[PDB]
Amino acid sequence: GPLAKIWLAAHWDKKLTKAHVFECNLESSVESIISPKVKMALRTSGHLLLGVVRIYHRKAKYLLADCNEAFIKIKMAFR
Amino acid sequence: MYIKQVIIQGFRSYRDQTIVDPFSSKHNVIVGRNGSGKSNFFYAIQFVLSDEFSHLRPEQRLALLHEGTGPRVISAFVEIIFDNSDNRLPIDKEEVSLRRVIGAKKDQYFLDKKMVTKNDVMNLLESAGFSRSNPYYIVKQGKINQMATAPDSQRLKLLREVAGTRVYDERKEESISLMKETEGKREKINELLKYIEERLHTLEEEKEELAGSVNKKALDQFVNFSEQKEKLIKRQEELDRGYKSIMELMNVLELRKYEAIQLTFKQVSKNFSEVFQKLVPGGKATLVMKKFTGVGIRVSFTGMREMQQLSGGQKSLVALALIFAIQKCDPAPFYLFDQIDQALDAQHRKAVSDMIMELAVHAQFITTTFRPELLESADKFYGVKFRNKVSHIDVITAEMAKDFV
Numbered sequence: 383g384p385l386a387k388i389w390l391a392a393h394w395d396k397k398l399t400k401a402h403v404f405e406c407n408l409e410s411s412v413e414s415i416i417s418p419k420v421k422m423a424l425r426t427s428g429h430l431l432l433g434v435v436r437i438y439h440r441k442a443k444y445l446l447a448d449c450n451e452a453f454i455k456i457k458m459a460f461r
Numbered sequence: 462m463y464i465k466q467v468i469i470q471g472f473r474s475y476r477d478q479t480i481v482d483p484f485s486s487k488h489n490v491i492v493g494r495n496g497s498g499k500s501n502f503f504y505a506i507q508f509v510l511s512d513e514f515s516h517l518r519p520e521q522r523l524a525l526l527h528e529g530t531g532p533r534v535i536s537a538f539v540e541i542i543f544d545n546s547d548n549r550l551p552i553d554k555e556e557v558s559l560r561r562v563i564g565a566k567k568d569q570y571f572l573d574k575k576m577v578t579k580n581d582v583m584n585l586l587e588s589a590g591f592s593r594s595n596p597y598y599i600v601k602q603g604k605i606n607q608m609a610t611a612p613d614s615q616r617l618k619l620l621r622e623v624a625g626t627r628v629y630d631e632r633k634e635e636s637i638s639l640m641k642e643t644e645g646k647r648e649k650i651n652e653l654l655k656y657i658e659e660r661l662h663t664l665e666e667e668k669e670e671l672a673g674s675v676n677k678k679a680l681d682q683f684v685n686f687s688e689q690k691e692k693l694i695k696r697q698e699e700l701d702r703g704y705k706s707i708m709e710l711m712n713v714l715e716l717r718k719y720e721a722i723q724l725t726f727k728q729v730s731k732n733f734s735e736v737f738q739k740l741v742p743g744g745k746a747t748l749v750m751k752k753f754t755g756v757g758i759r760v761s762f763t764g765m766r767e768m769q770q771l772s773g774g775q776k777s778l779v780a781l782a783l784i785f786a787i788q789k790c791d792p793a794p795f796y797l798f799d800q801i802d803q804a805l806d807a808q809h810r811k812a813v814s815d816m817i818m819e820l821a822v823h824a825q826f827i828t829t830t831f832r833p834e835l836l837e838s839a840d841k842f843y844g845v846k847f848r849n850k851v852s853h854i855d856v857i858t859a860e861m862a863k864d865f866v
């Protein structure tokens with residue numbers, strides 16, 4: 383399922399590749415938690431919440447890396 | 462997912478390398494005389510898997526080493542080999558080996574022969590559905606007693622842990638801290654994209670200036686940098702949208718949080734009745750709340766009574782019934798029961814046996830008993846023998862088993 387990837391990000395996030403992080407639609411992940419097919423325990427929602435935040439943090443990390451490198455590339459091209 | 466095999470060495474009475482014959486995926490019963498080493502075998506398994514053995518002072522660690530004559534034992538290990546055809550463990554292997562090795566100043570886990578941290582092992586088992594907040598994948602006579610003699614208040618706190626109140630509060634705090642440092646990343650991203658953007662404006666004026674009449678490399682790759690900038694912008698927008706949907710999620714969760722706790726309580730009580738009804742055909746039982754300040758048990762074997770005013774054997778069965786209910790609310794792929802039938806009538810031991818028989822169709826059970834009712838629900842039989850002050854475990858027959866009880 384889709385929430386299975388979020389679970390992995392909560393507990394064992396190393397299984398998630400950069401490609402996994404990039405592809406993850408956090409918006410529909412959140413709708414999957416917010417409106418589940420079957421009501422879920424407070425414990426499970428807490429895990430799923432951290433997983434979503436963890437994938438989100440990794441997107442920011444990769445994007446900051448790529449922005450820094452793009453800025454270095456451009457000013458290097460100036461000289 | 463189940464326990465395929467256990468290997469022990471140097472651990473309490475199991476001095477020598479002990480390779481236990483691989484378990485059945487259903488019900489395995491371990492029998493043997495008093496002081497043969499049944500409890501030590503369960504200790505070996507909780508030592509690898511249970512959170513209460515995760516932090517050990519040196520004196521506690523040394524207490525697990527074999528003590529006896531002959532050469533002095535100074536290291537021990539216990540290895541659990543899991544069947545993972547489930548892929549319930551997030552490891553892409555059909556078998557997964559988890560070994561814990563201890564010495565004078567060594568306490569080291571190995572996952573498929575590679576050092577991992579205890580934090581890893583905890584996460585690994587949480588991935589698979591073993592929650593630190595459920596103390597009941599492993600049930601011992603101590604746990605049954607501690608349940609039968611708990612204050613109505615301590616029952617409340619237990620069910621809240623199981624419900625997830627501590628977990629949610631902890632996950633929520635971790636998320637907020639992680640959210641907060643992500644915001645600093647997002648700010649740096651935005652400043653960087655602005656610096657890139659001013660470089661693109663400079664390049665554009667430099668390009669028109671030469672057209673109306675700064676290294677050439679930058680002018681050559683201007684369209685490239687502008688195309689690349691949009692790819693970063695699109696990912697930056699996704700972060701902005703993700704921030705909104707996460708804030709919405711945290712709000713929804715804080716608001717549903719009490720209905721979520723109440724949802725779990727209502728199901729635990731419901732299984733409690735169905736479990737007591739199956740165990741004691743006739744009567745029934747139910748939970749009740751406090752001033753809430755506590756959770757209480759009221760039960761009648763007759764076709765109501767408070768907890769204390771009950772037979773010490775009946776207190777044992779009711780608490781065990783509640784443990785079964787908590788388990789069904791939060792089921793796991795295998796269970797370890799150490800002499801859970803010690804303090805039970807013969808009639809009720811067969812009731813528990815008949816239950817496990819049904820449960821063993823879909824989960825593995827590894828149990829020890831000193832009484833013969835549970836032998837009827839078992840699929841593989843193991844005998845513990847204690848000779849020269851060391852324990853051994855062998856596969857025995859059903860007939861042999863009725864002989865170590």
Ligand SMILES: Nc1ncnc2c1ncn2[C@@H]1O[C@H](COP(=O)(O)OP(=O)(O)O)[C@@H](O)[C@H]1O
Nearest residue numbers: 473474495496497498499500501524526527528
């Ligand atoms: N650290 C140890 N080293 C060697 N033997 C031990 C150690 N701890 C306990 N034992 C022995 O192992 C035997 C008890 O094993 P135990 O598993 O509790 O018996 P039972 O089979 O009734 O559950 C006792 O002889 C006990 O003293």
